[PDB]
Amino acid sequence: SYDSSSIKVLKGLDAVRKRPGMYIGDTDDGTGLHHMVFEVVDNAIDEALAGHCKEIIVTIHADNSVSVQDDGRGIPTGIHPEEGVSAAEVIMTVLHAGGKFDDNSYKVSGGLHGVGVSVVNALSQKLELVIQREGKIHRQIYEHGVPQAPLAVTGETEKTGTMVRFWPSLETFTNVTEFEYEILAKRLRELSFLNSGVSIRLRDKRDGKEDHFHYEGGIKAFVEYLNKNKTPIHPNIFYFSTEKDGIGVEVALQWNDGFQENIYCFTNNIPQRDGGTHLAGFRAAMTRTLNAYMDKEGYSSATGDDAREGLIAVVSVKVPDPKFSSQTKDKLVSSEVKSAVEQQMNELLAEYLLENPTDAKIVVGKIIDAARAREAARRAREMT
Amino acid sequence: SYDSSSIKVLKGLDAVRKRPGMYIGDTDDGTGLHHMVFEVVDNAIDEALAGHCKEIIVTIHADNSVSVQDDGRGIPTGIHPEEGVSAAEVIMTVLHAGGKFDDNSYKVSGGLHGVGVSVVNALSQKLELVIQREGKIHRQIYEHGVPQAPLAVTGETEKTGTMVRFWPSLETFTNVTEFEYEILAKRLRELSFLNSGVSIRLRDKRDGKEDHFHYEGGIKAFVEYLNKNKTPIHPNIFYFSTEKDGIGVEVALQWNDGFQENIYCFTNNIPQRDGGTHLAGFRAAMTRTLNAYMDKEGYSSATGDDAREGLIAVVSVKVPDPKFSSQTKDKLVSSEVKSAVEQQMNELLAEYLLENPTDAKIVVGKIIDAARAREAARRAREMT
Ligand SMILES: Nc1ncnc2c1ncn2[C@@H]1O[C@H](COP(=O)(O)OP(=O)(O)NP(=O)(O)O)[C@@H](O)[C@H]1O
Ligand SMILES: Nc1ncnc2c1ncn2[C@@H]1O[C@H](COP(=O)(O)OP(=O)(O)NP(=O)(O)O)[C@@H](O)[C@H]1O
Ligand SMILES: [Cl-]
Ligand SMILES: [Cl-]
Ligand SMILES: [K+]
Ligand SMILES: [K+]
Ligand SMILES: [Mg+2]
Ligand SMILES: [Mg+2]
Ligand code: NA
Ligand code: NA
């Protein structure tokens, strides 16, 4: 019988355990598992974006838990008047709850849904929260998202910060159940390039391995690092950072003598593996600007794909309220970011080409060469 | 000051309006807008999967609203004891609320999150709900997700069904704000192929256009339709439907003399544009099975990509609890579906090749040809 009794409302964090795919992604291949860490790291990076955190420590513990310590402002501890429990507990236990729904606590933040750490909490067999704030140390333990006692003061400190340690639930995660140093290291290295002046440490207590990421030079250096085992064909990396019409657009790029295209897109320091409106705007401006230059200089027909070949590019945007298609934020679905990136690229790339004639002539040569190889491949196919 | 007062909990449907990207996708390019219709249609298709709905009517109204009428069981109308309002209102107003969290009301359903129609309601300036059930007509109106009065009985009927008409909010949707007949028609045509015996009608009150989709022949016919303006190279479409280990796997495919690959994947009748574990399993089985056949018959080196060229395939799986990465369900993230598709394909495709030697020899020829064209393209590139 299909009737009112058949309709069920999931409460608290039950929806997260029931439908983990829409909150954490794939619970079998390891991507969801490492995403648990990235949610916690993203919250610390948001304190760094806000100007309050200068050191982040990620530790893989020997019992297969992970901790993230930050020296930010600390998760608020006072009783939330509407909810009747510490703000920290609200945050850990309530979906669509947080401090990122306006721009008062974080001007710009990767976080926006009020969901991330509460998902981590929901899918962890245990979670330990330690908060240093207003002279005091606060502690609380959760099991499968259920707080064991209310947040309590345990001592004094001159410091501020948040430490979250979590033990993932094997009732949720299957197959890849251990953390992979290199997966975490890739992301943290990236975050160092994206956050100059923030010390990011990674420690593996299983084997004693550690890294300290504090790169100089931001996304321009990131482009160098990425071309390190390749052969750049021109010496001057194109770079700019602007803030126009409420949107930050930062781009670095350089061509190498290979044939792959590697464009890394980020929104508020969160990578979009599946691209989005920022990537679309970058592509459109690149195609237009190179075409105009080749027309004006009398080198002209090469398409957007020919420009792509040998390209390494980083596109980092800063947006007050971006729009992602999912909690995992693999794709940016914000049309106004396409226009901002496209506009800034069109203006500044055209200027780069004019100020750097040697590089410009090399890049044109490369585009023409890619076009020549494409047409030869096509002729060869047709003839078989 | 960042403190407990800075932490906000979004209630009811406020989170949906605040962060529409994670619920509906892109609110500017039209995809989110049409997805509003698809959520409502999916709920009717679920009544059809359950065996209770035989006719679905989709109408685009002249005032830019859309209605979906189904002749299913009807959304439950009785007071929900826990929530204190009609089950219908719970459904329309509460996230993670519905009848698809077990398999008692729907054995198999595209719906699983308890979110879809409540998102439609949240992002509509107005929504009209009419429910025919247990001898009675029930009606309710919402504005921006707020019910105007409680669900009320308005008359009598011998029929059963649900009608939802919604007017999308222009406070959410921008730029593409009108419905496109062809976008709806593509999906409904697909759904007719996927649901043999279900009459699906589409009517546009703006211009009088209509369609009635009731295709014979299921996904095998779907493959024909897709190859209609192309040139199939072998006459016998490979087809099977099995249900093993709790999973339905249904596949049809055929090669044409073109060079594109078009694999259409579905889970509980919902398309995955971004593929997933079903697509991964299909690819893996195809590659293995063709290779083994070419080895055994002495035709052997061609890769998975060469097999892909000229392929049209439909892969339709039926799963008790699938896992998607998002509310829009663009990607299936369920590892056990990869194994089920891979296993069934390996067994049944090998049998197809043995029972259809003429087709098998043609397909081998095509693979070898694709391989030859690929190597010639590569040589041609290298030489420029
Ligand atoms: N390390 C931290 N330091 C200070 N405040 C924090 C920290 N981690 C979490 N918070 C607070 O907890 C809130 C909720 O976090 P979370 O559940 O991850 O959602 P969110 O960051 O707001 N958005 P999202 O991650 O996109 O779902 C944040 O908005 C902050 O106000
Ligand atoms: N046309 C319909 N006929 C009968 N019951 C329906 C119909 N539409 C919705 N329902 C009921 O309303 C519930 C909630 O629908 P909805 O909010 O779309 O979530 P869902 O279908 O369960 N899952 P999802 O669409 O993946 O978020 C369903 O689970 C059904 O129990
Ligand atoms: Cl009822
Ligand atoms: Cl506080
Ligand atoms: K939260
Ligand atoms: K609902
Ligand atoms: Mg967060
Ligand atoms: Mg639904
Ligand atoms: Na914000
Ligand atoms: Na179910």
Residue numbers in the entry:
A (entry chain A), B (entry chain A): 4 to 303, 309 to 392
Give excerpts from the publication:
The focus of this study is the ATPase domain of Escherichia coli DNA gyrase, located in the B subunit, which functions as an ATP-operated clamp that captures the T segment prior to its passage through the G segment. The N-terminal 43 kDa fragment of the E. coli DNA gyrase B subunit comprises the ATPase and transducer domains. The latter domain participates in nucleotide binding and plays a role in signalling the nucleotide-bound status to the rest of the heterodimer. Evidence is provided for the existence of two monovalent cation-binding sites: site 1, which preferentially binds a K+ ion that interacts directly with the α-phosphate of ATP, and site 2, which preferentially binds an Na+ ion and the functional significance of which is not clear.
Refinement against a data set collected at 1.92 Å resolution from a crystal grown in the presence of both 100 mM KCl and 100 mM NaCl (‘K+Na’ data set) gave a model that was essentially equivalent to the original K-only structure, i.e. containing a K+ ion in site 1 and an Na+ ion in site 2. After superposition, the two structures gave an r.m.s. deviation of only 0.13 Å. Moreover, the geometric parameters of the monovalent cation-binding sites were closely similar to those of the K-only model. An anomalous difference Fourier map calculated using data collected from a similarly prepared crystal at a wavelength of 1.91 Å (K+Na-anom data) gave peaks corresponding to the site 1 species, the ADPNP phosphates, several Met/Cys S atoms and the previously mentioned chloride ion. However, this time there was no peak associated with site 2 (not shown), which was indicative of this site being fully occupied with an Na+ ion. We equate these effects to the occupancy of site 1, since it lies adjacent to the site of ATP hydrolysis and is capable of binding both Na+ and K+ ions, but has a clear preference for binding a K+ ion even when presented with both K+ and Na+ ions. By contrast, site 2 is more remote from the ATPase site and our structural studies indicate that it favours Na+ ions even in the presence of excess K+ ions. Nevertheless, the values for the N-terminal portion of the ATP-lid, including residues 94, 97 and 100 from site 1, were noticeably lower for the K-only structure, and to a lesser extent for the K+Na structure, relative to the two other structures.
